[PDB]
Amino acid sequence: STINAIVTDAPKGGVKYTKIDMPEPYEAKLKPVYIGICGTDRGEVAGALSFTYNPEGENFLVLGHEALLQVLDVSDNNYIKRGDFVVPLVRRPGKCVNCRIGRQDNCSIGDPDKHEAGITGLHGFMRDVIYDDIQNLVKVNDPDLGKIAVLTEPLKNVMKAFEVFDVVSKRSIFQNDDSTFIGKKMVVIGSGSEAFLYSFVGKDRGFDVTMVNRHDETENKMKMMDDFGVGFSNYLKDMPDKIDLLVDTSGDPSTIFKFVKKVNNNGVVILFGFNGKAPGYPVNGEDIDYIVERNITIAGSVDAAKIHYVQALDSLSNWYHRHPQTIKDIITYEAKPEETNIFFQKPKGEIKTVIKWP
Amino acid sequence: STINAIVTDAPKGGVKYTKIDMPEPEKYEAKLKPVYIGICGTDRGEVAGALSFTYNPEGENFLVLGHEALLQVLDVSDNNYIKRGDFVVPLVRRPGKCVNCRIGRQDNCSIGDPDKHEAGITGLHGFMRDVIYDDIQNLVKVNDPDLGKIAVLTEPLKNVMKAFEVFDVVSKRSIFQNDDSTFIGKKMVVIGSGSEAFLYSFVGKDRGFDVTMVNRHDETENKMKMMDDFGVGFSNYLKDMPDKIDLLVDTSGDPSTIFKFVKKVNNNGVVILFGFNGKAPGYPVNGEDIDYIVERNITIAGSVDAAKIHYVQALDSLSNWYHRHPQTIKDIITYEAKPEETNIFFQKPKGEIKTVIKWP
Amino acid sequence: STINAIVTDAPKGGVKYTKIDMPEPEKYEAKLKPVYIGICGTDRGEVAGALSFTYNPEGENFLVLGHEALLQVLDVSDNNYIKRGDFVVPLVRRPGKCVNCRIGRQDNCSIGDPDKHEAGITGLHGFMRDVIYDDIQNLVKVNDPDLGKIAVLTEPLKNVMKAFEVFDVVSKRSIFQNDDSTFIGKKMVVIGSGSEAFLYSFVGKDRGFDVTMVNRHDETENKMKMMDDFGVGFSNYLKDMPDKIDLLVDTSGDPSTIFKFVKKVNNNGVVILFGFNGKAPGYPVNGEDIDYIVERNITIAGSVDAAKIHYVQALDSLSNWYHRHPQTIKDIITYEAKPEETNIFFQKPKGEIKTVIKWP
Amino acid sequence: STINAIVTDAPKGGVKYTKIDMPEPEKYEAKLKPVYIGICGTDRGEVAGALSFTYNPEGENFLVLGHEALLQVLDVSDNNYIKRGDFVVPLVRRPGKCVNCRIGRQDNCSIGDPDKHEAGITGLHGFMRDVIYDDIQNLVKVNDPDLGKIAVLTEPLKNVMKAFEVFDVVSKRSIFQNDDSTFIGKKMVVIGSGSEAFLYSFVGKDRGFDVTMVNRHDETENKMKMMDDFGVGFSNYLKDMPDKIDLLVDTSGDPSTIFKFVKKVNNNGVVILFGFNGKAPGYPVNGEDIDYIVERNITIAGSVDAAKIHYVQALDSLSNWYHRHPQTIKDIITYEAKPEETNIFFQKPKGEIKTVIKWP
Ligand SMILES: NC(=O)c1ccc[n+]([C@@H]2O[C@H](COP(=O)([O-])OP(=O)(O)OC[C@H]3O[C@@H](n4cnc5c(N)ncnc54)[C@H](OP(=O)(O)O)[C@@H]3O)[C@@H](O)[C@H]2O)c1
Ligand SMILES: NC(=O)c1ccc[n+]([C@@H]2O[C@H](COP(=O)([O-])OP(=O)(O)OC[C@H]3O[C@@H](n4cnc5c(N)ncnc54)[C@H](OP(=O)(O)O)[C@@H]3O)[C@@H](O)[C@H]2O)c1
Ligand SMILES: NC(=O)c1ccc[n+]([C@@H]2O[C@H](COP(=O)([O-])OP(=O)(O)OC[C@H]3O[C@@H](n4cnc5c(N)ncnc54)[C@H](OP(=O)(O)O)[C@@H]3O)[C@@H](O)[C@H]2O)c1
Ligand SMILES: NC(=O)c1ccc[n+]([C@@H]2O[C@H](COP(=O)([O-])OP(=O)(O)OC[C@H]3O[C@@H](n4cnc5c(N)ncnc54)[C@H](OP(=O)(O)O)[C@@H]3O)[C@@H](O)[C@H]2O)c1
Ligand SMILES: [Zn+2]
Ligand SMILES: [Zn+2]
Ligand SMILES: [Zn+2]
Ligand SMILES: [Zn+2]
Instruction: Note whether A123 and A133 are within 8 A (CB).
Output: no
* SS3 assignment, position D357: strand
**Cis-peptide into C145, omega within 30 deg:** no
User: Which CA distances in Å does B85 have to B36, B160, D90, D185?
Assistant: 15, 28, 47, 22
D97 contact B CB<8A: no
Together in a domain, A113 and A46: yes
Instruction: Note whether B258 and B284 are within 8 A (CB).
Output: no
Report the CATH number at residue A69.
Answer: 3.90.180.10
User: Which CA distances in Å does D8 have to A121, D13, D257, D359?
Assistant: 54, 6, 32, 18
| Residues comprising chain A, all counted | 358
Together in a domain, C286 and C346: no
Q: What are phi and psi of A5, to 5 degrees?
A: -165, 150
Contacts of B9 (CB under 8 A, 6+ apart): B56, B61, B62, B63
Together in a domain, B215 and B312: yes
Q: Which residues pair with C72 in a beta bridge?
A: C33, C87
- d(CA A350, CA D23) in angstroms, rounded, equals 71
Instruction: Note whether B192 and B254 are within 8 A (CB).
Output: no
CA end-to-end distance (rounded Å), chain C = 18
H/E/C letters for each residue in chain B? CEEEEEEEECCCEEEEEEEEECCCCCCCCEEEEEEEEECCHHHHHHHCCCCCCCECCCCCCCEECCCEEEEEEEEECCCCCCCCCCEEEECCEECCCCCCHHHCCHHHCCCCCCCCEEECCEEECCCCECCEEECHHHEEECCCHHHHHHHHHHHHHHHHHHHHHHHHHHHHHCCCCCCCCCCCCCEEEEEECCHHHHHHHHHHHHCCCEEEEEECCCCCHHHHHHHHHCCCEEEECCCCCCCCEEEEEECCCCHHHHHHHHCCEEEEEEEEECCCCCCCCCEEECHHHHHHHHHCCCEEEECCCCCHHHHHHHHHHHHHHHCCCHHHHHCCEEEEECCCCHHHHCCCCCCCCEEEEECC
The H or E element that residue D18 is part of is strand D13-21
- Taking residue D65's Cβ as centre, other Cβ atoms within 10 Å add up to 30
Q: Which residues pair with C76 in a beta bridge?
A: C30
- d(CA C98, CA C111) in angstroms, rounded, equals 7
- d(CA D211, CA D229) in angstroms, rounded, equals 13
* SS3 assignment, position A123: coil
User: Which CA distances in Å does C196 have to C281, C348, C353?
Assistant: 22, 16, 9
B99/C99 touch (CB, cutoff 8 Å), yes or no = no
Chosen for mutation from B205, B309, B311 (greatest number of chain D CBs closer than 10 Å) is B309
Q: What is the DSSP letter of A280?
A: P
Going from the Cα of B61 to the center of ligand 2, the distance in angstroms, rounded, reads 30
To the nearest 10 degrees (0 to 180), the angle between helices B221-229 and B195-206 is: 20
The burial class, CB within 10 Å (0-12 / 13-18 / 19+), for C115 is: middle
* A73 torsion bin: left (phi>0), alpha (psi -120 to 50), beta (else): beta
Q: What is the DSSP letter of D81?
A: S
* B210 torsion bin: left (phi>0), alpha (psi -120 to 50), beta (else): beta
B293/A300 touch (CB, cutoff 8 Å), yes or no = yes
Together in a domain, B180 and B310: yes
Going from the Cα of D59 to the center of ligand 5, the distance in angstroms, rounded, reads 38
B106 contact D CB<8A: no
Together in a domain, A193 and A177: yes
Closest ligand 4 atom, CA of D197?
A: 16
Closest-CA residue of chain D to B178: D103
- Taking residue D223's Cβ as centre, other Cβ atoms within 10 Å add up to 22
To the nearest 10 degrees (0 to 180), the angle between helices A306-320 and A193-204 is: 80
Instruction: Note whether B205 and B232 are within 8 A (CB).
Output: yes
- Taking residue C12's Cβ as centre, other Cβ atoms within 10 Å add up to 11
Instruction: Note whether A94 and B285 are within 8 A (CB).
Output: no
- d(CA A221, CA A351) in angstroms, rounded, equals 9
Spatial CA neighbour of D6 closest among D348, D342, D343: D342
H/E/C letters for each residue in chain C? CEEEEEEEECCCEEEEEEEEECCCCCCCCEEEEEEEEECCHHHHHHHCCCCCCCECCCCCCCEECCCEEEEEEEEECCCCCCCCCCEEEECCEECCCCCCHHHCCHHHCCCCCCCCEEECCECECCCCECCEEECHHHEEECCCCCCHHHHHHHHHHHHHHHHHHHHHHHHHHCCCCCCCCCCCCCEEEEECCCHHHHHHHHHHHHCCCEEEEEECCCCCHHHHHHHHHHCCEEEECCCCCCCCEEEEEECCCCHHHHHHHHCCEEEEEEEEECCCCCCCCCEEECHHHHHHHHHCCCEEEECCCCCHHHHHHHHHHHHHHHCCCHHHHHCCEEEEECCCCCCCCCCCCCCCCEEEEECC
- Taking residue B181's Cβ as centre, other Cβ atoms within 10 Å add up to 22
C-alpha B7, offset from chain centre: 21
- d(CA D187, CA D248) in angstroms, rounded, equals 9
D183/B316 touch (CB, cutoff 8 Å), yes or no = no
Spatial CA neighbour of D190 closest among D169, D176, D204, D207: D204
| Residues comprising chain D, all counted | 360
* SS3 assignment, position A324: helix
List Cβ<8 Å contacts ≥24 apart for C210-213.
Answer: C210/C185, C210/C186, C212/C187, C212/C188, C212/C242, C213/C189
- d(CA C11, CA B21) in angstroms, rounded, equals 60
- d(CA D215, CA D197) in angstroms, rounded, equals 10
Together in a domain, D173 and D237: yes
- d(CA B201, CA B231) in angstroms, rounded, equals 9
Q: Which residues pair with C265 in a beta bridge?
A: C245
Identify residue B119 by its one-letter amino acid code: A
Together in a domain, C228 and C298: yes
CA atoms within 13 Å, Cβ hemisphere of A250: 23
Q: What is the DSSP letter of A238?
A: S
- d(CA A301, CA A269) in angstroms, rounded, equals 10
Q: What is the DSSP string of D288-319?
A: HHHHHHHHTT-EEEE-----HHHHHHHHHHHH
- d(CA D326, CA D318) in angstroms, rounded, equals 10
Together in a domain, A107 and A162: no
Resolution of the solved structure (Å):
2.2
Spatial CA neighbour of A86 closest among A63, A106, A68, A60: A68
Range of the domain at D303: 150-332
- d(CA D142, CA A108) in angstroms, rounded, equals 28
Q: Which residues pair with B272 in a beta bridge?
A: B249, B301
Identify residue D265 by its one-letter amino acid code: V
Chains that touch A (3 or more CB pairs under 8 A): B, C, D
Going from the Cα of D173 to the center of ligand 7, the distance in angstroms, rounded, reads 15
Q: What are phi and psi of B209, to 5 degrees?
A: -75, 155
Contacts of B186 in chain D (CB under 8 A): none
Q: What is the DSSP letter of D177?
A: S
Q: Which residues pair with B124 in a beta bridge?
A: B119
Instruction: Note whether C248 and C262 are within 8 A (CB).
Output: yes
Together in a domain, D228 and D319: yes
Contacts of C308 in chain A (CB under 8 A): 178-180
Q: What is the DSSP letter of D175?
A: -
- d(CA B157, CA B160) in angstroms, rounded, equals 5
Listed by number, the residues of chain D in 222-281 with a beta carbon closer than 8 Å to a beta carbon of chain B are none
- d(CA B125, CA B115) in angstroms, rounded, equals 16
Instruction: Note whether B273 and B105 are within 8 A (CB).
Output: no
Contacts of D129 (CB under 8 A, 6+ apart): D3, D4, D5, D6, D20, D22, D34, D64, D66
Q: What is the DSSP letter of A155?
A: H
Handedness of CA C342, C345, C349, C355 (dihedral sign): positive
User: Which CA distances in Å does B260 have to A275, B283, C208?
Assistant: 19, 10, 43
A292/B275 touch (CB, cutoff 8 Å), yes or no = yes
The finding on whether D334 has its CB within 6 A of some atom of ligand 4 is: no
Going from the Cα of D75 to the center of ligand 2, the distance in angstroms, rounded, reads 45
Angle among Cα A199, A263, B98 to the nearest 5 degrees reads 105
Contacts of C197 (CB under 8 A, 6+ apart): C190, C191, C213, C251
Instruction: Note whether C287 and A175 are within 8 A (CB).
Output: no
Q: What are phi and psi of B8, to 5 degrees?
A: -145, 180
Q: What is the DSSP letter of D196?
A: H
Ligand nearest to the CA of B252: 2
- d(CA B167, CA B274) in angstroms, rounded, equals 12
- d(CA B270, CA B257) in angstroms, rounded, equals 16
Q: What is the DSSP string of D133-151?
A: EE-GGGEEE---TT-GGGG
The H or E element that residue A66 is part of is strand A66-74
A182 contact B CB<8A: no
Report the residue numbers after which chain D has a gap, meaning the C atom sits over 2.5 angstroms from the next written residue's N, or none: none
Spatial CA neighbour of A2 closest among A17, A19, A16: A19
- d(CA D2, CA B342) in angstroms, rounded, equals 76
Together in a domain, A231 and A143: no
C180 → closest Cβ in A78, A135, A318: A135
- d(CA C317, CA C206) in angstroms, rounded, equals 9
Report the CATH number at residue D295.
Answer: 3.40.50.720
* SS3 assignment, position A167: helix
- d(CA D219, CA D234) in angstroms, rounded, equals 8
Instruction: Note whether A299 and B172 are within 8 A (CB).
Output: no
Q: Which residues pair with C214 in a beta bridge?
A: C191, C235
Q: D162 to chain C nearest CA, in Å? A: 10
Query: Which value, in Å, is the radius of gyration of the alpha carbons in chain D?
Result: 21
Instruction: Note whether C270 and C301 are within 8 A (CB).
Output: yes
Burial call B207-221: b when 16+ CB within 10 Å, e when fewer: bbbbbbbbbeeebee
- Taking residue B27's Cβ as centre, other Cβ atoms within 10 Å add up to 6
Instruction: Note whether C237 and C214 are within 8 A (CB).
Output: yes
Q: What are phi and psi of A120, to 5 degrees?
A: -125, 85
- Taking residue D192's Cβ as centre, other Cβ atoms within 10 Å add up to 22
- d(CA D81, CA D140) in angstroms, rounded, equals 10
Contacts of A252 (CB under 8 A, 6+ apart): A189, A273, A275, A278, A279, B287
Chosen for mutation from A98, A100, A179 (greatest number of chain D CBs closer than 10 Å) is A100
User: Which CA distances in Å does C121 have to A107, B27, C58, C332?
Assistant: 52, 42, 13, 25
Tell me which residue has its CA closest to atom 3 in ligand 4: D304
Contacts of A102 in chain D (CB under 8 A): 99
Closest-CA residue of chain A to D175: A173
D182 contact C CB<8A: no
- Taking residue D222's Cβ as centre, other Cβ atoms within 10 Å add up to 12
The H or E element that residue A266 is part of is strand A263-271
Identify residue D58 by its one-letter amino acid code: E
Instruction: Note whether D2 and D24 are within 8 A (CB).
Output: no
Instruction: Note whether C72 and C32 are within 8 A (CB).
Output: yes
The H or E element that residue D328 is part of is helix D326-330
Together in a domain, D204 and D346: no
- d(CA D14, CA D29) in angstroms, rounded, equals 32
The finding on whether D195 has its CB within 6 A of some atom of ligand 4 is: yes
Tell me which residue has its CA closest to atom 27 in ligand 4: D252
Burial call A131-142: b when 16+ CB within 10 Å, e when fewer: ebebbbbbbbeb
Contacts of C109 in chain D (CB under 8 A): 267
Identify residue D289 by its one-letter amino acid code: D
Q: What is the DSSP letter of A327?
A: H
A321 → closest Cβ in C183, C185, C324: C324
Spatial CA neighbour of D69 closest among D15, D138, D20: D138
A288 → closest Cβ in B170, B253, B290: B253
- Total tally of structural domains belonging to chain B: 2
Together in a domain, A74 and A1: yes
**Cis-peptide into A11, omega within 30 deg:** yes
Instruction: Note whether B106 and B304 are within 8 A (CB).
Output: no
User: Which CA distances in Å does D327 have to D152, D157, D330?
Assistant: 16, 18, 5
